C-alpha cells in the first residue's frame, strides 16, 4: 500500500 510508505519513512528516520 503506497499510503503506508510515508509512515515507514517517518519511523526509520526517527532512529
Amino acid at each position, epitope marked *: 500500500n503506497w*499510503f503506508d*510508505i*510515508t509512515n515507514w*519513512l517517518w519511523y526509520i528516520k526517527k532512529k
Partner: antibody
Amino acid sequence: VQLVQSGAEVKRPGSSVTVSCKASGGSFSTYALSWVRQAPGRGLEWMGGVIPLLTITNYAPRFQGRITITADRSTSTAYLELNSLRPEDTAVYYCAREGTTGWGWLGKPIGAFAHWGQGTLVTVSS
Amino acid sequence: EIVLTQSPGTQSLSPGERATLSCRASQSVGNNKLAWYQQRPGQAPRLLIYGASSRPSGVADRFSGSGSGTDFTLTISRLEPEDFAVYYCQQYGQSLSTFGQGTKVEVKR
C-alpha cells in the same frame, strides 16, 4: 502547513495542463501529496500522488498513461500534468497532503488528506 | 478497485437531530483506512475522521466514526447549522484510493 495552487486556466481539447501546488510549513519531502478533482456538480475523484523524497508516484488506473505528478524539493512545489484533455476533464483540481498526528506538523503521517489547496478550475473548451 | 457506496445520497434532517451516514465497501478495507470529509459549496473538503474512527484535533467531537471491514458509519450526534453539507468517505487501504459518491445532509422543513 498551507498549499497554494496556480490560477484557473482555459485549455483547448487535446492540450496538456500543468497545475502547481506550493507547500509551506512542515516537511515537504517525506509526506504524501495527492491530486483530487471534482467535475462541476460531481463527486471527488482521487487521481494519484507522489512522495517526493523517494520519487514514488502512484496513479489511479483511470489516469495511468495521461498523468504525470512531479515534485520539486528545491521549491516545495508539486505539479500535476494531465494530457489529451477533453471536455469531461473540466473540473476543480485540488492538491492535498496527508495529515500528521500530535503537536506541530512533523509528526507521524496519517495517510488521509488533512491539508488542501484552494483548488484550480481547469476549463477544457475551444 | 474498491467501490464505496454511500446510501442514501441525501438525508433530510432537522437541526439538533442525530445523523448516521453509511459507507459500504465492495471489499474489505485494508487496516480500516477509511476517512470521512465534509465539503460545503464553494469550499475545499475538510478531513473529519481517519482510520475509521480517529478524529483530528480541531474537529468537533460531535463527529465520530465507527465500523471496520466493509461497513462504516459517520455519526453526527446533534446537527448544528454548519453541519448541513456534503460528506464523502474515502478508502486508502490499497494504492488505488477511492471515494464514495457523497451524502448530502440537508435541512428538512
